[PDB]
Amino acid sequence: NSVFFGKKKKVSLHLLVDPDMKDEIIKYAQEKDFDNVSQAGREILKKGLEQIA
Amino acid sequence: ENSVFFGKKKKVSLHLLVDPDMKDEIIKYAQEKDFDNVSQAGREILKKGLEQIA
DNA sequence: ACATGACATG
DNA sequence: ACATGTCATGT
Numbered sequence: 001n002s003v004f005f006g007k008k009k010k011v012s013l014h015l016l017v018d019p020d021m022k023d024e025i026i027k028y029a030q031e032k033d034f035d036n037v038s039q040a041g042r043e044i045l046k047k048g049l050e051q052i053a
Numbered sequence: 054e055n056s057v058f059f060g061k062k063k064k065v066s067l068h069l070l071v072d073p074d075m076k077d078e079i080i081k082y083a084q085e086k087d088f089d090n091v092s093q094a095g096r097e098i099l100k101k102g103l104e105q106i107a
Numbered sequence: 108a109c110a111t112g113a114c115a116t117g
Numbered sequence: 118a119c120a121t122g123t124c125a126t127g128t
Contacts, residue, residue: 009108010070013079014121015092017067017099024103025067038069038110045071045095048102049078056118063118070109092120 013041067095 017025029040057063071079083094 003108007108008073011073011076012068012122013071013076013091013095014066014068015095016064016119017096018062019065020062021096021099021103022065022067024107025099028103028106036110037067038071041067041069041099042071042075044099044102044106045075045079046102047105048098048100049075049082051101051105052082052098066112068111090120 025040025044026037028044029035029037033039033043079094079098080089080091082098083089083091086097087093
């Protein structure tokens with residue numbers, strides 16, 4: 001991850017979520033990701049994905 | 054308005070950049086489970102992820 | 108590049 | 118009210 005030559009750019013993920021859900025993600029971002037919400041969203045999505053398989 | 058009084062919550066925008074590989078995975082899940090509705094797949098996935106945390 | 112939203116079509 | 122995308126502005 002992070003910066004390096006040829007690294008593929010990220011793609012826009014845009015969706016509507018419940019207020020409570022977005023708030024949990026924001027709190028999580030402030031405590032673990034330096035308030036970077038999109039970073040927090042990826043970590044949580046990754047955690048959600050391994051629960052699928 | 055009405056639905057509001059009974060607890061129906063208006064959804065809010067979550068906009069973030071994701072690695073192309075992860076999006077392909079959210080999309081494959083949307084295909085298998087939500088009739089390709091990526092937003093709905095993202096909610097279900099995010100919820101499972103949040104359930105870990107707390 | 109990336110992070111956030113405001114615009115902008117179906 | 119949703120779903121998805123592209124612009125635009127400040128990092």
